[PDB]
Design a protein around this ligand. Structure first.
Ligand code: K
Ligand code: K
Ligand code: K
Ligand code: K
Lengths: 292, 292, 292, 292
């Protein structure tokens, strides 16, 4: 599933920094129970940055195992070298994931033709559906609507997670792609506006802690009930902003711990423990949302 | 060691995309002959991003072999995970490199305290001298003067490559660090200005194809002869700009091939061959510098 | 009227730079005939910048005279000194304008409290409805949603022309103001998106040359017929961008001349005549729109 | 004339918002005693934006009277309409001012060719020396090096106030103009750096309250003693920043009142009285500079 509220799930860790299956099993049950449409496993919020390839495969396979067919799983699979992106992607064919979320090459700042070739080659070498992932603030490059339109012709490239927060991109992309190409917000604070403009869902950090409200909000949005959806979004808005008061996923792992969803809020360096000030800001956002 | 003109050397490849030893030798001889002060091996311009860790180490070890004690070698050693940066760096202990050019974590956008902990831990697990590298346009992370000041107190953190192009950083950093902390430009177009403000040298892309001019500019600058240095700078200023007309190292590899310094201009995807228009542009810049 | 398509009308000039009543009368008849909801007289596109106060009053009074009750007129009335804004505004009370379009103070970059006091004082000293006008790219200051919410409580401050092109502002403002506060786009290229998000109309430059299409597009938007409106907007999109290929109102006065709506495209220094390249870009946009 | 420390002098007012002659005299005596090189009368810091043309001229004429030949006076003379800039400037012919500080048109955002024509025409209708003033953060217009180069060929266009804070502009401009074209900083926080790169002085806000320190810094800089100059700079650096903690001239007027240099800190709307928090901030900056 590639519509509705999709959670960019945390990778819960014990005090040592190792994946905590008990915590993960709890999150997964919570998402099944709360009507989340799918799980993005080891994406940005899942600390894709800092897991090695072994860990990355382990988490994805463990998520699929615990999900046990109850909710679709999408793997985070980008790389900034094309041959490596192909190679990492091969390892997930026939795994049970429904699709891949693949980020623009980061650091090396390719041209639009380079992005075209990169994503075209990745799609050529798998049967899996590919969701493009654009987030210039993290990668230093911006996948533009024209090039998205070129890529959407590739049978396997089925949508985009647009994380710029630039809402003009929704209809610039939509007019260049087919009615079945999925547009998903990657920016929680603007995601309702993004849906109102014609987007189909969100790949959400807030959904880690407000899964039911997010699923209801996205459903109402899909039905065209924007004023109703916006009541929910207003109660979530502090969390949509304050889950980024320190670098993601520091605030959201702290909030998960606070709600009892995971055992510890431990992360891997260079992510640091939440400051005291951050914890007060996040606590207040959680209370505004009604979760505390 | 870490002063004057330091080349951010290209990793010349064959048509297959593997390192071309004959070409690397020719480049390294060219730098020894030209007066280049040191070589940064497999940094950004050297396609750090698209070589695996073994290929990377093979290139460094080869560069060191070919250098044969005639010119110091600094290895590119970034990682966006601290445990990993430490391992990756440990491999070069006792290699013969004189230092590491270690980039800020990219993509995961750590806090300043995160950056402090990451570099402090790297430095604690090696005796290799470490040069910090700040390039927010590639990384999404900006290592601020205050944090550089904190890090410069670590024994083996010995300097910074400041690739922002923001000249105000030179004196901000310089007043927070001791007199032997090395300040190097990572932005060719502003490097002479950077040295005029108290900088000590440059890790240069332009030096790949103008190694003598760059070594002479930097000597003039260190001796206070800025008017004279600026004459060379004006000759090179179109290179300094047009070597980025397409994503680095696309232009500089072409230029190297056109000057006969390397056999092929092949790069790895997502870097793409230079366009016709980029070629005419870079060619006019080489003519203007009198290299062609 | 403060909904629908409102034209930011040009001030047509003879070869000497003086207002051309014949040309103005033609534009006004054209807007009456084409279903434009209102006319903004001497706003940004009307060269408010370069008319003295005498000329400014003359143009507004001449527009009201020629309009002859057939279409409502709104005057451009900002100043960057509060006492002067009050004083200029007094001169229009009982003139027959339906309202004023008043820009944030430009150049002196006041604080949000300063903007609050400025606009509050202007509204206090007239009975005329006031439309706030936010355009940071021209003024150097950005009127934020919070402060808009404070001002919308003032009986007389009835809406905003939001010219940032930042579509997140639509619902940030809407949730802070009453359902009768009017939100109008000041950015043609994003104005349809702005309406889709909950805005009520546009204060448009494109409407100078595509008045009927703009009025139909805004009407369909108000009815919730976004796909229908977007067909029109796609044919106008080149014009929405290329009317700013050189500084407004250079392109749009050239286009008016080309369509026979005004006698000359003359403007006042520091606005310059359209270049040859600009005229080709604009001509093509006009043909894309179906006007040539 | 146009070198060393030039004060962007405040227009001190009484409680009514009119110029306070006793305060202006005290300031002008303070500058003669302190070694300030010249006074910019009714520029940005002098509330050029909120005085009418007659009030403006009254302040200049008074400043000149009070200066009584002991210190050169430069008048602020911008307009965003060329015909008007010419008239406004003509009024000072034969006044006794030594030059005009003429700002780029603000709000209407002219092309570079427009800026060329505007300043060329101003210069053609006066024999007063003209200093260009580039401050895109206030004006929305950026006068580029290439255009400054074209203008510096006009006989009486004699220098530039570069208030961008972008130090790369110093040598870009310097290589395009003759050796007697004056390059002045308009950004206190970067001014010593600016002179280190070849700049000749600064039109300073900080000099209102630290006139001796600023005159001594600038002399040290012109004599090549940058380390010594930087000591003074570090003393003043919190002023250089915190005099903009609220919109200029709000902080500097308060500071002037606290040091006893002016009777009141009154400004005209839309400038607002300093907040409590801004006051404590500016007070700590004055203590740090040893002025308090
Ligand atoms: K497709
Ligand atoms: K050190
Ligand atoms: K109201
Ligand atoms: K001149």
């Amino acid at each position: 599933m590639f519509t509705g509220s999709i959670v960019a799930i945390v990778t819960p860790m014990d005090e040592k920094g190792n994946v905590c299956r008990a915590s993960l099993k709890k999150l997964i049950d919570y998402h099944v129970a709360s009507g989340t449409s799918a799980i993005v496993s080891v994406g940005t919020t899942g600390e894709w940055a800092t897991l090695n390839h072994d860990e990355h495969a382990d988490v994805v396979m463990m998520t699929l195992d615990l999900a046990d067919g109850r909710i679709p799983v999408i793997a985070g699979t980008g790389a900034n070298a094309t041959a490596e992106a192909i190679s990492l992607t091969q390892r997930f064919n026939d795994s049970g994931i429904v699709g891949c979320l693949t980020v623009t090459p980061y650091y090396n700042r390719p041209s639009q033709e380079g992005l075209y070739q990169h994503f075209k080659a990745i799609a050529e070498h798998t049967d899996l559906p590919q969701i493009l992932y654009n987030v210039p603030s993290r990668t230093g490059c911006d996948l533009l609507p024209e090039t998205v339109g070129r890529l959407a012709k590739v049978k396997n490239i089925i949508g985009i997670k647009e994380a710029t927060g630039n809402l003009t991109r929704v209809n610039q992309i939509k007019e260049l792609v087919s009615d079945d190409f999925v547009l998903l917000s990657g920016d929680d604070a603007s995601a309702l506006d993004f849906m109102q403009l014609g987007g189909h869902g969100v790949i959400s950090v807030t959904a880690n802690v407000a899964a039911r409200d997010m699923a209801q909000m996205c459903k109402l949005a899909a039905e065209g009930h924007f004023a109703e959806a916006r009541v929910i979004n207003q109660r979530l808005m502090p969390l949509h902003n304050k889950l980024f008061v320190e670098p993601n996923p520091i605030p959201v792992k702290w909030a998960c711990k606070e709600l009892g969803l995971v055992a510890t809020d431990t992360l891997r360096l260079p992510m640091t423990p939440i400051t005291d000030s951050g914890r007060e800001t996040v606590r207040a956002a959680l209370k505004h949302a009604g979760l505390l």
